[PDB]
């Protein structure tokens, strides 16, 4: 056994004194974030159109040209036109009696043109309901057969059909609400909110003033039930060159909003640090980030829905959970969050604690940054709280153990100083140190008996050793941890049953009845551990693959009919099926 050295240091007497470090100032725990309990309503940018109901009144005018051959008949042309019903026929025939006259009279291609149904005299025809289709709105018409002229052989003849159609349609408008489109596909180049009264004349129109009338005190008569309505309304009636549309006039402000309510958060926590507010919601797992200054709702164009929906939702959420435990402090506050979110926040305070330029906000489509800000902060605050508690406990343990190190210096100053300097040293209020030389190739005697005085016998093994090989064998005595002392001064009385292990160079030497028996390895004695185990493993690497529930090619294929692809096929028809180059003379 030679993996361990041996050591000789003299008596420590010198100016090299050393002291232990005194207790350190342990760190203070971080105080913690102060929150404000509160109620929030979160708003996004409105992307939905403004939707309203309208009624179309038009006449399908059809004039056909038939040539009558000997055996057959051939259409030579079919002319289809859409004629608007006049204002006076909507009010005094259709809304009044449920009838429409059999003559269309209208201006077309800068000419007043008239058309009689079946080329017959004018009569009033009853509007009857249309044939039912699924997922269609209601409709009414006057005739269901086309009129074609009767046969006179080898002549061209003409026949006119007039069908008065009334249709209910859905109408859609998008900001700045200068136009709207109907369910037919027909644009109307007038604001839905246009009118002659109540200041509405500032709204857009691109039609002449004789095309627009308003009827106050309008009572709608249902065309199926034949029932007149009980409450009046103001109707806008606009005659276009193809149809006349009718709709209710409403004021623009309580109908339209630039924002729309997205989330109602009953428990919204507000924290202030770093010159910002952090609005955390534990239910939807988001944190929003805003500046300290509130946002003025006078900066939002068409933003009257925001204060209405906020005050209504806050009062429900206060009257559902916070009824007996909290009070509202102040009025609702408005904040613009990063990503384009408007937050209406109502601060609360518990009953225990109560001792004393116009513009458009653009929202992002991905809330994932706010949900990553939540999950990061929730893990960060927990790992900083736990590792800070370990750091205050590690400092307190290392200060508490210093008392055990002061009582152990006086017992064994050799081993305590050699454990706190970093090198084996000798030591003997301060402590004075000395560095040993390191010898090896030591021989041990076989007798622990003092021959001079037979009634005594040495406690520790006798050794003989050499500093280097050119030096004499120095007589000494084996000490603690392979320290070979220079004096033979460890005496003790001789007893019975004497049995000893002593550490001798990487293994134990065994003496029985003051006589050398045999040397051992350390792998012979049973090892007990002073140590407390702690098996910390590392967190392994993980790879995040791209993952989507629908690719962008899937969301575009979800539509039934693609306008770019149908027009690309249809306009290639003469390049596939005709010849556009040849001219016959």
């Amino acid at each position, epitope marked *: 056994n030679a993996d361990a050295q041996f050591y000789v240091c003299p008596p420590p007497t010198g100016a090299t004194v050393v002291q232990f470090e005194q207790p350190r100032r342990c760190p203070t725990r971080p105080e913690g974030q102060n929150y404000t309990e509160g109620i929030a309503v979160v708003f996004k940018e409105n992307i939905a159109p403004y939707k309203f109901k309208a009624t179309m009144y038009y006449k399908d005018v059809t004039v056909s040209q038939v040539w009558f051959g000997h055996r057959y008949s051939q259409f030579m042309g079919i002319f289809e036109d859409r004629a608007p019903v006049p*204002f006076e026929e909507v*009010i*005094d025939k259709i809304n009044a009696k449920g009838v429409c006259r059999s003559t269309a009279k209208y201006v077309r291609n800068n000419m007043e043109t008239t058309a009689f149904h079946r080329d017959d005299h004018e009569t009033d025809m009853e509007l009857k309901p249309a044939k039912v289709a699924t997922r269609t709105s209601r409709g009414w018409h006057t005739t269901d057969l086309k009129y074609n002229p009767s046969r006179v052989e080898a002549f061209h003849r003409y026949g006119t059909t007039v069908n008065c159609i009334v249709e209910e349609v859905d109408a859609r408008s998008v900001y700045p609400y200068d136009e709207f489109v109907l369910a037919t596909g027909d644009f109307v180049y007038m604001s839905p909110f246009y*009118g*002659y*009264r*109540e*200041g509405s*004349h*500032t709204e857009h129109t691109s039609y002449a*003033a*004789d095309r*627009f*009338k*308003q*009827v*106050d*005190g309008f*009572y709608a008569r249902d065309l199926t039930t034949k029932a007149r309505a009980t409450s*009046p309304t103001t109707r806008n009636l606009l005659t276009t060159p193809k149809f006349t549309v009718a709709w209710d006039w409403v004021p623009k402000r309580p109908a339209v909003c630039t924002m729309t309510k997205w989330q109602e958060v009953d428990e919204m926590l507000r924290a202030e640090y770093g010159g910002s507010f952090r609005f955390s919601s534990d239910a939807i797992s988001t944190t929003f980030t805003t500046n300290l200054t509130e946002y003025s709702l006078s900066r939002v164009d068409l933003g009257d829905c925001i204060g209405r929906d906020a005050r209504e939702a806050i009062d429900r959420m206060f009257a559902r959970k916070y009824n007996a435990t909290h009070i509202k402090v102040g009025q609702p506050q408005y904040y613009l969050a990063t990503g384009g979110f408007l937050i209406a926040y109502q601060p609360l305070l518990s009953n225990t604690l109560a001792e004393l330029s116009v513009e458009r906000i653009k929202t992002t489509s991905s809330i994932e940054f706010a949900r990553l800000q939540f999950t990061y902060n929730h893990i960060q605050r927990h790992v900083n709280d736990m590792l800070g508690r370990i750091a205050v406990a590690w400092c307190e343990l290392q200060n508490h153990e210093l008392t055990l190190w002061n009582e152990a210096r006086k017992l064994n100053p050799n081993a305590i100083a050699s454990a706190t300097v970093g090198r084996r040293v000798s030591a003997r209020m301060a402590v004075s140190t000395c560095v040993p030389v390191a010898p090896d190739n030591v021989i041990v005697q076989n007798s622990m008996r003092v021959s001079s005085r037979p009634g005594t016998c040495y406690s520790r093994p006798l050794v003989s050793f050499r500093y280097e090989d050119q030096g004499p064998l120095i007589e000494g005595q084996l000490g603690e941890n392979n320290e070979l002392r220079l004096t033979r001064d460890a005496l003790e009385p001789c007893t019975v049953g004497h049995r000893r292990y002593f550490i001798f160079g990487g293994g134990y030497v065994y003496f029985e009845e003051y006589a050398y028996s045999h040397q051992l390895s350390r792998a012979d004695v049973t090892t007990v551990s002073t140590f407390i185990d702690l098996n910390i493993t590392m967190l392994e690497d993980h790879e995040f693959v791209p993952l989507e529930v629908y690719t962008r090619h899937e969301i575009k294929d979800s539509g039934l009919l693609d306008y770019t692809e149908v027009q690309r096929r249809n306009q290639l028809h003469d390049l596939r099926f005709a010849d556009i180059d040849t001219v016959i003379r």
Partner: antibody
Framework: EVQLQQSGPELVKPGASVKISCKASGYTFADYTMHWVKQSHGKSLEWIGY????????DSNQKFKNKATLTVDNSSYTAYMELRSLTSEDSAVYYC???????????????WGQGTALTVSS | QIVLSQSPAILSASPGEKVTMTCRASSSVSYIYWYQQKPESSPKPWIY???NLASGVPGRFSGSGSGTSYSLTISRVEAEDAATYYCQQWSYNPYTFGGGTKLEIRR
């Protein structure tokens, strides 16, 4: 031609009620609105309100809510204005006027009555 | 109630002179409407839809304006053109009339 014959009781007691009429002739009485205005001693013209003889819809000045009520006689082609609780400031010339039953650019008082002159005194 | 201040309160004119009378509104109105009242007689329609001339009025009258500012002009003033002229609006409830502008002829 179009004429609005307007006659009513002209001398009345304070704290009473009077009914002015405006007989219409020369046009269909049911497809125009009948309006009423007030001209006190040449100071201004104040609009009272109107009535549609067909749908019986009424839109009125809120200044005259506790003062005037409007009605029609469809069989007689006459409109009526009833002025209750007559004080002396009600003494004025009251006119009747024709107007279209819609709001266009053309819509204006195109025919008038001659005016009944009311006097609240003793 | 919307107000129609109608300046001047009284204007004097010599026969042949071009004169003008204004009507300015408190809020914006869609159209303006003019009426003529001679004493012991009803008002008669004079100018409708800010520019159009009523049935039987002379071509020497013209109107102009939009929004909150309106005007009535005579190219050469005759002696029968001597009455009060009222501007009125119906864009708001109630319909209101202006204060009137009295036209006096010089001799």
């Amino acid at each position: 031609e179009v004429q609005l014959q307007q006659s009513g009781p002209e001398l009345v007691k304070p704290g009473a009620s009077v009914k002015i009429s405006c007989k219409a002739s020369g046009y269909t009485f049911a497809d125009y609105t009948m309006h009423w205005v007030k001209q006190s001693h040449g100071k201004s013209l104040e609009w009272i309100g109107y009535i549609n003889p067909y749908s019986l819809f009424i839109d009125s000045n809120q200044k005259f809510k506790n003062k005037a009520t409007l009605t029609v006689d469809n069989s007689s082609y006459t409109a009526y204005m009833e002025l209750r609780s007559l004080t002396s400031e009600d003494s004025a010339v009251y006119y009747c006027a024709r107007f279209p039953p819609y709001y266009g650019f053309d819509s204006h008082f195109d025919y008038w009555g001659q005016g009944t002159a009311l006097t609240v005194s003793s | 109630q919307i107000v129609l201040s109608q300046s001047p309160a009284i204007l004097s004119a010599s026969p042949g002179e071009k004169v003008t009378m204004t009507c300015r509104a408190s809020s914006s109105v869609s159209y303006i409407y003019w009426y003529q009242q001679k004493p012991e007689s009803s008002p008669k329609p004079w100018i409708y839809a800010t520019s159009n001339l009523a049935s039987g009025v002379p071509g020497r009258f013209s109107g102009s304006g939009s929004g909150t500012s309106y005007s009535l002009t005579i190219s050469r003033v005759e002696a029968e053109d001597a009455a009060t002229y009222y501007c009125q609006q119906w864009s708001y409830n109630p319909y209101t009339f202006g204060g009137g502008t009295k036209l006096e002829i010089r001799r």
